[PDB]
Every structure is written in structure tokens, then in C-alpha cells.
Amino acid sequence: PQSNKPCMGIVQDTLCGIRKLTLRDTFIELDQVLNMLYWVPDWDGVIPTPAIIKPKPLWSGKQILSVAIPNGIHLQRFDEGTTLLSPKDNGMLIIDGQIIFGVVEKKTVGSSNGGLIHVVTREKGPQVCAKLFGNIQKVVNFWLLHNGFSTGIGDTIADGPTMREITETIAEAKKKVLDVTKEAQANLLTAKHGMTLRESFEDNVVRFLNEARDKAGRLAEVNLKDLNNVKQMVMAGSKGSFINIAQMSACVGQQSVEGKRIAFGFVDRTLPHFSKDDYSPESKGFVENSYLRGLTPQEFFFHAMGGREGLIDTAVKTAETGYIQRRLVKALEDIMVHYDNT
Amino acid sequence: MNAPDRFELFLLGEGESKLKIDPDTKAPNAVVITFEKEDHTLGNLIRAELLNDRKVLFAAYKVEHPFFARFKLRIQTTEGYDPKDALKNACNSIINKLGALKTNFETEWNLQTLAA
Amino acid sequence: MSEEGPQVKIREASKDNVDFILSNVDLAMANSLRRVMIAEIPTLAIDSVEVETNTTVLADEFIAHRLGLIPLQSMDIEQLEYSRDCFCEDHCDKCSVVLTLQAFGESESTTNVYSKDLVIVSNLMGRNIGHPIIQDKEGNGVLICKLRKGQELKLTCVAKKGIAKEHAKWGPAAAIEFEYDPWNKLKHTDYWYEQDSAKEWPQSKNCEYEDPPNEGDPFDYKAQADTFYMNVESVGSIPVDQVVVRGIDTLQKKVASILLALTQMDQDKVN
Amino acid sequence: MIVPVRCFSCGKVVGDKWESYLNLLQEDELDEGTALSRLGLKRYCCRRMILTHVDLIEKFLRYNPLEKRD
Amino acid sequence: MSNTLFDDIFQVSEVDPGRYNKVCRIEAASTTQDQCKLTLDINVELFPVAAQDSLTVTIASSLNLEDSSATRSWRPPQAGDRSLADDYDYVMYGTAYKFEEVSKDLIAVYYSFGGLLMRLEGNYRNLNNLKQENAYLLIRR
Amino acid sequence: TLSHLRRTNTPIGRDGKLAKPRQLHNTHWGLVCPAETPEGQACGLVKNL
Amino acid sequence: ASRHGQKGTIGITYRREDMPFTAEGIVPDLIINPHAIPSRMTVAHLIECLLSKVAALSGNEGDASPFTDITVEGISKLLREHGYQSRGFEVMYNGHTGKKLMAQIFFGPTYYQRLRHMVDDKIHARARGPMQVLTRQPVEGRSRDGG
Amino acid sequence: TTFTHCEIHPSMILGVAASIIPFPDHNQSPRNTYQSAMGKQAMGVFLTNYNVRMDTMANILYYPQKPLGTTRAMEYLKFRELPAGQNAIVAIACYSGY
């Protein structure tokens, strides 16, 4: 009742599996269908007629997974660019318990509004949804025990051409920043609206570097195939996002402290290895490497400060939030809905 | 410590029946048979052999929790044919196959020793 | 020759390793055979120790655990009895074996306590059993402990009969290799590649025993797994051919127990 | 701490081979990989057992259980 | 009354593999009638199909060659049993979920064989009897 | 033991809300370990050479 | 715990028969979940696994110091000299049925440390027992069987 | 171009706790902090003469193994003389959901 939406759902590896099961690619033979149908404790002893009767009987994952879903459940969801005959296998259509079309993933069996869990609870009851959790988990875990799944260092590697465009984008951003520096050093740069000249220079540099990192990350993400395990986990919705892929593969980016770049701790520099009055990005906390490539010492130091900030944040604001929470609950503890409805 | 004794994996307790047969109330000519102190080694073999009988419709097994050594088997056969008879035929066929396998291996090993 | 049954082709053999092909068989049967070969074949191992003198630098259960894994000859294990069945109190003469260990570090240089110094004092009744397994050139076998000047160890060991489903010490097989379908004709595994899947994955040694598939052939959607390639190595207690034969016998006895129980229950139903 | 008798992974026995393995390292002046393969250690788990062993029994042995200081 | 509800001969233009590695989508035009087109998802690994091929497509309501298996459990095939499936070379079972009226004289029907989709576009009289809820699609190459 | 014989304490109130003494500073390069620090109320206040 | 901030608890133990195995009869001493890699970006865990595997197969100590010249591609080249798939994957069979597994599995040695927290030192229950002298409420302390 | 000194080695900007992580620069920094914390709760040979001492508590490991991947700095912390763990074969996978 805090946000009127489900607080539980299919999570972690069952979620990673219920998606690999319902692709159009996945077909099941006879023996495994028999074992799977036995595993569902609410089975009624009827074997679904296959979808490919000849020249070999096969079952589609959607067909076996439809056994767990109760009867009388209807669901419609139209995603971007999906027609009544989906070519991308997007959206979801469930009619009287049968998956017509659509892959099932975090938007369907997760803790989201209007998903399968919410409609099942609002139509049948809490006990039926409680049964549904275990039916789905048993079926999908039994199948995933024989399919298999892993992850390795080969999923963070990108092909050479993608590396080439990555380096070229980084180089062009560096050139733009250098040109803005040259313009500002000749008193030609114009201060922005209600905002000092130094702030204008800093704003331009920060924006250029952030856009560079984002574009490189998107190139490296578009390169990846469909049989990549990290991409599969991200697509399913179970662990990670495109930021993680970008940092492990494309580039880490710009380390900050207190919302600004790495200030001058010494007098007119940031580290004894630089020269006085240096404003280049690599000297003010920019990491152009990746976790797969390796960090050089200075950007390692700047990354360490960036992490220290968040560590401190957690360690203290735990206590402050605790005090606020106690005061709030003590203030309101004696309020009750009466029989007058007041 | 709460670690159960290991010998509970291969020694039946007193008052324990190695087999328990129970008619299934949903499909005609179907029985659920519980085996005790056994694991996939036997269930997989028996189900794979029961899948070769043209009069056997359904044959499936499961091991509900990996803490306990026991499993369930489910059989459904055609009309006028007893699932217990199907189980007996499967066991006989498995035994004959294993005997032939043993004789073949002994012949080959003795031939190798002659060639050793 | 039995042409209606499983076929076997031994290619290699030795005291420890057997390397062979098993054909005209289901996959379930071969899997069950390997599971039984690893888990359910009895053997003889030390199951209790009692210590008199311990002036070493190691603990007591430490040396007990070291002793509990030493391999001993168990060829005639069919003539012993489970100690939970023998009517004797504690350990029998028919339901146990007994050894003694004594060592003393008289010399200045440290002295190693190997497993060649276990001496059997019970009565074997003419059975080939209880001998320690020795496989190194020097004959010393498993080294057990270490001694200095003025240190002594004295203890007595009781060895019994059991299986590997209750402790890893009774297992007679080290590791068994199990392969089939090296050309992926059946499409059972799906390969992971960067550029060309056919090159990144190396080739198994077994490819020479089948013919490569041709690109013009459509996917054969009727085949089943029929040929398996196995290799079995023994710890040393039991000969390896005996490991295979005893695995088959144990599987047979399990199925026969199922059959006997079923016949008993049918007779009960007759009543 | 004396060498483990058995391999934790494949059940094999490596306990007896430690003494002979130490011989090849200085009497024959061989490298570690060839010495490890000379004794039939072929799975890399057995190589793991033998290769990464810290023999602490030769330090306790110069010592007594009576009177350590701090 | 014969079981076969629809029968025709089509010719395929192009195949659409997409991202999949087993399933392909094809579109085809009827060589007899000009106002009949077909879009179909098929399992190529069993029934390979190339461009510019002629295929006989039948929609039937039962495989028994002579006159309750909808609610009966599917039983494995027996030796000595003959049926309509013995003639063709690719048989699939599915259910229909949408009847669309494109115009006055054209209608489309959608079928879903276990997640494999098919759209059939044709004249009213040709697709008059396709109001069924479960059907067998048979294909002969 | 090695880490304990090489520890420095900054005697400021460990509940004191001064953020600047906690954070890593540009002058710590080479004289203080940036990685190793406790967690909780002694974050940044306890240093290791 | 491993050396990269990845710690956990034992949740179940299996015997060598139910363990998935490779074609060479090798069995994993432990199995972890891959849902722990992405959000933590511990690529050093994967690199340590790869390099330790190469060192075990080869038989020499493998350098892993920071700010050096070792790269991932170099150790992958040194790996393929021995006869394994370069990205550390391997073919593994199911332990129960003996079939092949559709997806390959990342496999190799690592270093683990046994931490100081055992479940035997945290387990506690109480039905009744001693009280306090002043407040007469159940005492504090697990070793003094308190509430 | 007017240099006055040089760094003897960058690795020395790290303490004693973090001189045992392998490839620390391929890691997010809080992960290095977390392992620098947890490196003080491993079980191992705290002294080679633990036999006499009557400490209030002590834990000892049966068989310790020196790591296969070692940093060069360990040769000064003596981590290959008194290790604190074992080399375990690990398979990263999904298997039975446990």
C-alpha cells in the first residue's frame, strides 16, 4: 500500500530462464515434456497436442509454460512498433490461459503494474498467485537445469572495428575540449547567461566529456550479438544495464568530487606529476580506459576519491535517516480509522 | 549440529516398505509408485525403459527435494494392461540387457588379456 | 555371440585404466552404469582409530582423518559382513580387520612414518584382503606423518566394509571420462563464437572414429544417442575390470530387488 | 602441514609422490611443469594439489610444544 | 462432408530469417486466385524452403480420414494407423485468434501454432468456412 | 598483525559530521593507502600507511 | 570469500554424482551464480580465473601485479597453446541424466578464504530460563541463554 | 621536460592489506575497500609456533595453499609462507537454482 503495486515477483535466475524458454527458437521433445508436465503439481493428466505433428512431434516453450498459468486469465500489452502479428515478438497476448505471442520478461512476471501477478491476484485471489509462483519456479528451474547458463570474460570483449570507432570518438571529444580551451585563453569566449566565464568553460568541458562517454558506450552496446550472456541478462531485466557494459567495455569516464571535477589540492595543480595551470581533461580526472584494459595510476587515484564519497554518504546518512524515521513514527502513531469513517 | 546420519541413504528404517503403489484418481489406468532410499540412477533407467513399450502412454518421475533419498514414478498404460505388468517387463528387459553387456565385456577383456 | 544385446569394444587396458566404446545402448543405461561405478561398489578402509602415545606436532583427529583415506586391498570383500549385521559385540573376526601402528624417532635426522608400517594382527581366514596398496617405485606408499628425536606414536586401527554413498574414502574409481557425438550431428550443444565457431573450438580425439558431416545433408531429425566413449581409472584397491563387472552386478541386484518387492506386493494383493 | 594424501577433486592419490617430486627439482634440475607431468599428474587439479603446497611441517619440527614466548 | 475446410496452391516470394536460427517467415501469393496471400512462420530445420517454390496448402478440421480429441490427451502414433497426415509432408496444429475485415470483399484470418504466426488474406467466399477455432495446417512440397 | 602495527587515528569525534577530514585528499598520494579504510563511523578517520 | 569483494554462504552440498562434469571427468569443487558479475564489474575475478587456469595447466607462478604489461589477449594465446577454448569455456554434461548441456560453462581455479563466521556460533533458541535480579526480564547473551 | 625526481614504483602507493588483491586496477574501488576489510578474517597460520601459546581463541587451517596468481609485493608480506586460503576449482553457472 505504499505505492499500490506488487512487492514480489520472479527475480534473478528464474527470470533469466523464463525468457530463454519462450523464444520462438525453443522446441521441446517428448520425454522432457512428460517430465515437465509431471513437475507441475496441479496437472490434470492431459497431454497438450503438439504444434508440429509431422515429421516429428515437438512442443514450443510457450506451450509447456502455459500449463502453469491458470485458465481464464487474459492479458494484452502492445510495445513500441508491434502489430496484431508481431514481427519482433514484442508485446504479450494471453487468451484463456494460452500464450498467443510475446516473450515473457521483467515487464510481465516482475513487480510491475498491470503485469501477470497483479491481474492474477486481482482476479483469482492470493492463494492462486501463491501457487503460481511455485509452479513457474519449478517448471523454469527444471528446464534451466538441463539447458545451462554461464558468463565469462568473453562477454566483455568487443571486435576491433568497434574499438576503432570508440577511440575515434574519444579523440574528437578531446579535440573539441582543446579548441574551447584555446578560444577561452584568448579572451574571446563569451560568458553564458547569468554565469561566470570560468563556470562556462567548466560546463562546456564536462558536457563534451559526458557525451563522448555515452556515445562510445552505445556503439559498444550495439556491437554485441544475441548470444552474449551479459546482453541476455540485461535484456531479461535481471542484472545490470548499459552503463555497466559501457564501463567494462568502452570507457570508464569522468571522475568527479562534490559535483565538480578534481579540484586543485596542491597549489595550481592536482598532482605532482603535472605542470602548473593545467586544464586538460586527463589532468582533471578523466578515465579514457576501461575495466578490461586497465587504469593508469592517476585515474586510479581519482576513481578512488569518487568511490570514497559514496562510502561516506552511506556510512553517515544511515544514522541521520534513522533519527528522522523515529521522529516521524512517534509523531503519527495514534491515528486510526473509526466506524464513523472519520 | 543437525547433520543427519549418512546411512539413512541406503538402510531402510523399520516399518518401511521399499515400494508403495497408489492409484491415480485423474487418468484411467494410472499409478503413482513411491520408491524409498533411491535416486536418479534407478528412476531414469526405469523411465527410459518404460518409454519403449508401445502400450505405455505416460511414464514420468521426480525427486521433490535433494535432502531425502526417495522418488516418485507415474505410469499410465492402455486398456486391458496392468502398469505393474509393464514395470515387470521393463525390469526383465533391463536385467537381460545387463547380463548380455556383462558377458560381452568379459569376452572382450579376456581377449585383450590374451593379446596383452 | 549375443547379437541382441549391448556391444563393447575395448581399445586400451592396463592395471589402472580401461579405455573402451559402448555401442547399441541407451544413454540412460550408460549414465546409470557410471553413477553406480563411482558411488555404489564396496571396498575396505579404516573406520576407527585408538591412540596410546602421541608425541608428534600434529593433532589426533588429524592423523585419524589421514589414516581414514589410505587404500587397502579389498578383492574378496564379498565374504565380509556389514558390522551392523554381525552378531558379535563391537567388531567381529568376521566383520572387521585390525591393524597396529608403532613408530619412534630414535635418530637425530627426522624419520618419516609411511603406510608400509601398518601391520595386520587379526586372523584373515585365508582371504585376500587387508593388504595396503602400494604403487610407487620405492614401495613406501602413502606417507602418514613425521618424527624427530624423542617422539613416538602408537595406535590401533579397525577397518570395515562400506560404500562411497556415505564417505569418499570407500570409493574405488578416481575419475571416469564419458563422451559422445563429437561432431554434434544431433545438435545437443550450441557453440559460442566470436567470428567462426568451427575454428575456435578444438577437436576431440574421438573425431577420428566417426565421419564428418557434409554441408549438403539436411539435419537428420530421427537419430538417437547410441555410441559412447568411456575411460575408467581405479584408485588401486580393486582391479578395473572388476570395477566394471561389479558395477553391472550391483545394478542387476538393484533391479532384481525391485522385481522381488513387486512380486511380494502382488502376492499380498492376491490375499 | 604434511601433503594431502588424496586429491580433493578427482579422488586420485598424490600423497606418496611428494618425496619423488622434490627429487626431480634439484637432482635433475628440471622445470616445474615437466616434473609435474613426469609423475602422471595430467588433470590440472592434481597439478594444483602438488604445485601450490606450503610444507609447514619442517618449521614446527624445530620446536617443542612447551615454551613459546611472544 | 469432407473435413478439408480450405485448399490451394501458393508460390513463395522471399524468406525472412531474422534473428532466429531455426524459424523463418515467408510470404506467398496464390497462383489460382489473385486476391489470396499468405504470411507464415515455419520450422526450416525440418522443412527447408527456398524462394520461388510452389507449395500445396490445406486447412483441415480433423486428421481422421473417416467420420473428441480436443479434450482428449494426445496419444503417440501407432503402427497400422492411417490418417490424412500420411499424404502431406508438414502438419501443424493451431488455434485462430483474429478475423479481420480489411475491406468489403477481402478478409484476413490469424492462426497461432504454438507461438508461430500465420496470416491468410483472401476473398470472403474462399475463406467462408475458416470460422473454426482449432485447425490443422498441412503442407505438401 | 601487519595491518594493526601500521595504523593511525585522527582524534576527531567519530560521530562528528565534518565531511572534509573523512574524504581522501590530494596530499595523500604515496603516504596513505587510498583503498583500505574501515566502514561505519570510522570511515576515513582511521588511516593506514 | 574471494579476493575481489565476492563473499557468500554455502546453501547446499552435492555429491560427485550430481555434479556436472566435463568430457575429461573433472568436477567443480564449487559453483557460483553468474548474476553477481555485471553490477559489481569485477572483471579482475574473471582475469584471475583465466590466468590461474593457465598457470595450473603450465606449471609456473603467474604475475598479477598492478600497472604492468600483461593483457587478456596474451594469456588467451598462451591458453590456446594447451588445447582449450580461448575464452575459458568448456563442454559439460548433466550429472543426473548424462545429456549434453546446451550452453557452455566458464570453468577454472580461483582462490578462496574461509571467513570467521560459522553458523554454529550464531544459532540460538530459548523457551524459558534465568531472569534478571532487578528488572526480572530474560537475560542478555547467547552464551547465557538469553532472549 | 624539467624533471627533478622519479617514482620508484606506483604500486607502493598501496598499503599492506591491498597488496594481495590481484589486478586491483580492473576493479571498482569500493570492491578493493571491501576486500581490504575482509582480508583480516581469513583463517590461516597466524604464527608458526601456535602450538605452545594459550590464546583465548585460535583458528588454524589444515592445508594452506599459496595462490597461483601472486602480486610481486607479496614477497615482502610473506604471504607465500603463511597463506590464508585454498585454490578451489570454480564453475560459474546456473545449476538447480541453489
mmCIF file with all atom_site columns, N, CA and C in Angstrom, chain E residues 25-50:
data_model
loop_
_atom_site.group_PDB
_atom_site.id
_atom_site.type_symbol
_atom_site.label_atom_id
_atom_site.label_alt_id
_atom_site.label_comp_id
_atom_site.label_asym_id
_atom_site.label_entity_id
_atom_site.label_seq_id
_atom_site.pdbx_PDB_ins_code
_atom_site.Cartn_x
_atom_site.Cartn_y
_atom_site.Cartn_z
_atom_site.occupancy
_atom_site.B_iso_or_equiv
_atom_site.pdbx_formal_charge
_atom_site.auth_seq_id
_atom_site.auth_comp_id
_atom_site.auth_asym_id
_atom_site.auth_atom_id
_atom_site.pdbx_PDB_model_num
ATOM 1  N N  . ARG E 1 25 ? 10.169 -16.811 -41.706 1.00 0.00 ? 25 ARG E N  1
ATOM 2  C CA . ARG E 1 25 ? 8.876  -16.269 -42.095 1.00 0.00 ? 25 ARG E CA 1
ATOM 3  C C  . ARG E 1 25 ? 8.862  -16.050 -43.598 1.00 0.00 ? 25 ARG E C  1
ATOM 4  N N  . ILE E 1 26 ? 7.817  -16.550 -44.252 1.00 0.00 ? 26 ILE E N  1
ATOM 5  C CA . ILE E 1 26 ? 7.707  -16.491 -45.701 1.00 0.00 ? 26 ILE E CA 1
ATOM 6  C C  . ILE E 1 26 ? 6.376  -15.859 -46.075 1.00 0.00 ? 26 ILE E C  1
ATOM 7  N N  . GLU E 1 27 ? 6.349  -15.271 -47.267 1.00 0.00 ? 27 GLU E N  1
ATOM 8  C CA . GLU E 1 27 ? 5.137  -14.713 -47.840 1.00 0.00 ? 27 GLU E CA 1
ATOM 9  C C  . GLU E 1 27 ? 4.959  -15.277 -49.239 1.00 0.00 ? 27 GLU E C  1
ATOM 10 N N  . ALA E 1 28 ? 3.707  -15.501 -49.616 1.00 0.00 ? 28 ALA E N  1
ATOM 11 C CA . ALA E 1 28 ? 3.397  -16.231 -50.831 1.00 0.00 ? 28 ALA E CA 1
ATOM 12 C C  . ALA E 1 28 ? 2.092  -15.722 -51.419 1.00 0.00 ? 28 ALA E C  1
ATOM 13 N N  . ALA E 1 29 ? 1.963  -15.888 -52.731 1.00 0.00 ? 29 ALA E N  1
ATOM 14 C CA . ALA E 1 29 ? 0.777  -15.486 -53.470 1.00 0.00 ? 29 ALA E CA 1
ATOM 15 C C  . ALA E 1 29 ? 0.148  -16.702 -54.130 1.00 0.00 ? 29 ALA E C  1
ATOM 16 N N  . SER E 1 30 ? -1.175 -16.672 -54.254 1.00 0.00 ? 30 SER E N  1
ATOM 17 C CA . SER E 1 30 ? -1.905 -17.784 -54.846 1.00 0.00 ? 30 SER E CA 1
ATOM 18 C C  . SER E 1 30 ? -1.867 -17.681 -56.367 1.00 0.00 ? 30 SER E C  1
ATOM 19 N N  . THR E 1 31 ? -1.448 -18.768 -57.019 1.00 0.00 ? 31 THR E N  1
ATOM 20 C CA . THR E 1 31 ? -1.357 -18.795 -58.468 1.00 0.00 ? 31 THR E CA 1
ATOM 21 C C  . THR E 1 31 ? -2.711 -18.972 -59.146 1.00 0.00 ? 31 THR E C  1
ATOM 22 N N  . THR E 1 32 ? -3.717 -19.466 -58.428 1.00 0.00 ? 32 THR E N  1
ATOM 23 C CA . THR E 1 32 ? -5.054 -19.626 -58.989 1.00 0.00 ? 32 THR E CA 1
ATOM 24 C C  . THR E 1 32 ? -5.861 -18.337 -58.863 1.00 0.00 ? 32 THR E C  1
ATOM 25 N N  . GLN E 1 33 ? -6.009 -17.831 -57.643 1.00 0.00 ? 33 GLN E N  1
ATOM 26 C CA . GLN E 1 33 ? -6.744 -16.603 -57.373 1.00 0.00 ? 33 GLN E CA 1
ATOM 27 C C  . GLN E 1 33 ? -5.768 -15.487 -57.028 1.00 0.00 ? 33 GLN E C  1
ATOM 28 N N  . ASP E 1 34 ? -6.022 -14.297 -57.574 1.00 0.00 ? 34 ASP E N  1
ATOM 29 C CA . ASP E 1 34 ? -5.089 -13.186 -57.425 1.00 0.00 ? 34 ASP E CA 1
ATOM 30 C C  . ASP E 1 34 ? -5.196 -12.483 -56.081 1.00 0.00 ? 34 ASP E C  1
ATOM 31 N N  . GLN E 1 35 ? -6.319 -12.625 -55.378 1.00 0.00 ? 35 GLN E N  1
ATOM 32 C CA . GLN E 1 35 ? -6.563 -11.901 -54.135 1.00 0.00 ? 35 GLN E CA 1
ATOM 33 C C  . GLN E 1 35 ? -6.331 -12.758 -52.895 1.00 0.00 ? 35 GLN E C  1
ATOM 34 N N  . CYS E 1 36 ? -5.356 -13.666 -52.937 1.00 0.00 ? 36 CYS E N  1
ATOM 35 C CA . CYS E 1 36 ? -5.056 -14.541 -51.810 1.00 0.00 ? 36 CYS E CA 1
ATOM 36 C C  . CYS E 1 36 ? -3.560 -14.503 -51.539 1.00 0.00 ? 36 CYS E C  1
ATOM 37 N N  . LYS E 1 37 ? -3.182 -14.075 -50.336 1.00 0.00 ? 37 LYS E N  1
ATOM 38 C CA . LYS E 1 37 ? -1.780 -14.033 -49.944 1.00 0.00 ? 37 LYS E CA 1
ATOM 39 C C  . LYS E 1 37 ? -1.620 -14.646 -48.560 1.00 0.00 ? 37 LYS E C  1
ATOM 40 N N  . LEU E 1 38 ? -0.409 -15.128 -48.292 1.00 0.00 ? 38 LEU E N  1
ATOM 41 C CA . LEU E 1 38 ? -0.120 -15.908 -47.100 1.00 0.00 ? 38 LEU E CA 1
ATOM 42 C C  . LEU E 1 38 ? 1.180  -15.426 -46.473 1.00 0.00 ? 38 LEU E C  1
ATOM 43 N N  . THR E 1 39 ? 1.163  -15.217 -45.156 1.00 0.00 ? 39 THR E N  1
ATOM 44 C CA . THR E 1 39 ? 2.366  -14.962 -44.380 1.00 0.00 ? 39 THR E CA 1
ATOM 45 C C  . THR E 1 39 ? 2.452  -16.016 -43.282 1.00 0.00 ? 39 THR E C  1
ATOM 46 N N  . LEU E 1 40 ? 3.585  -16.708 -43.199 1.00 0.00 ? 40 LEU E N  1
ATOM 47 C CA . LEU E 1 40 ? 3.659  -17.920 -42.400 1.00 0.00 ? 40 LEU E CA 1
ATOM 48 C C  . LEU E 1 40 ? 4.994  -18.017 -41.677 1.00 0.00 ? 40 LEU E C  1
ATOM 49 N N  . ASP E 1 41 ? 4.957  -18.481 -40.427 1.00 0.00 ? 41 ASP E N  1
ATOM 50 C CA . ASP E 1 41 ? 6.158  -18.850 -39.688 1.00 0.00 ? 41 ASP E CA 1
ATOM 51 C C  . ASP E 1 41 ? 6.326  -20.365 -39.718 1.00 0.00 ? 41 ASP E C  1
ATOM 52 N N  . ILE E 1 42 ? 7.507  -20.830 -40.138 1.00 0.00 ? 42 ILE E N  1
ATOM 53 C CA . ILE E 1 42 ? 7.764  -22.256 -40.293 1.00 0.00 ? 42 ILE E CA 1
ATOM 54 C C  . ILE E 1 42 ? 9.090  -22.630 -39.641 1.00 0.00 ? 42 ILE E C  1
ATOM 55 N N  . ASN E 1 43 ? 9.210  -23.919 -39.324 1.00 0.00 ? 43 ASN E N  1
ATOM 56 C CA . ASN E 1 43 ? 10.429 -24.503 -38.766 1.00 0.00 ? 43 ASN E CA 1
ATOM 57 C C  . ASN E 1 43 ? 11.258 -25.039 -39.924 1.00 0.00 ? 43 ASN E C  1
ATOM 58 N N  . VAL E 1 44 ? 12.262 -24.269 -40.339 1.00 0.00 ? 44 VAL E N  1
ATOM 59 C CA . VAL E 1 44 ? 13.019 -24.601 -41.545 1.00 0.00 ? 44 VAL E CA 1
ATOM 60 C C  . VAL E 1 44 ? 13.866 -25.854 -41.342 1.00 0.00 ? 44 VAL E C  1
ATOM 61 N N  . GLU E 1 45 ? 14.386 -26.058 -40.128 1.00 0.00 ? 45 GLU E N  1
ATOM 62 C CA . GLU E 1 45 ? 15.302 -27.174 -39.903 1.00 0.00 ? 45 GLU E CA 1
ATOM 63 C C  . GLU E 1 45 ? 14.652 -28.515 -40.223 1.00 0.00 ? 45 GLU E C  1
ATOM 64 N N  . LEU E 1 46 ? 13.327 -28.587 -40.179 1.00 0.00 ? 46 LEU E N  1
ATOM 65 C CA . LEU E 1 46 ? 12.599 -29.791 -40.561 1.00 0.00 ? 46 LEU E CA 1
ATOM 66 C C  . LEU E 1 46 ? 12.147 -29.759 -42.016 1.00 0.00 ? 46 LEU E C  1
ATOM 67 N N  . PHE E 1 47 ? 11.705 -28.596 -42.500 1.00 0.00 ? 47 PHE E N  1
ATOM 68 C CA . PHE E 1 47 ? 11.075 -28.458 -43.812 1.00 0.00 ? 47 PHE E CA 1
ATOM 69 C C  . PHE E 1 47 ? 11.703 -27.278 -44.545 1.00 0.00 ? 47 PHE E C  1
ATOM 70 N N  . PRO E 1 48 ? 12.931 -27.438 -45.042 1.00 0.00 ? 48 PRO E N  1
ATOM 71 C CA . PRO E 1 48 ? 13.620 -26.304 -45.676 1.00 0.00 ? 48 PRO E CA 1
ATOM 72 C C  . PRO E 1 48 ? 12.851 -25.780 -46.876 1.00 0.00 ? 48 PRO E C  1
ATOM 73 N N  . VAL E 1 49 ? 12.834 -24.455 -47.012 1.00 0.00 ? 49 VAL E N  1
ATOM 74 C CA . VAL E 1 49 ? 12.086 -23.776 -48.065 1.00 0.00 ? 49 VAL E CA 1
ATOM 75 C C  . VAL E 1 49 ? 12.974 -22.695 -48.672 1.00 0.00 ? 49 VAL E C  1
ATOM 76 N N  . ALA E 1 50 ? 12.963 -22.607 -49.998 1.00 0.00 ? 50 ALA E N  1
ATOM 77 C CA . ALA E 1 50 ? 13.688 -21.589 -50.739 1.00 0.00 ? 50 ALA E CA 1
ATOM 78 C C  . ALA E 1 50 ? 12.704 -20.648 -51.425 1.00 0.00 ? 50 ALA E C  1
#
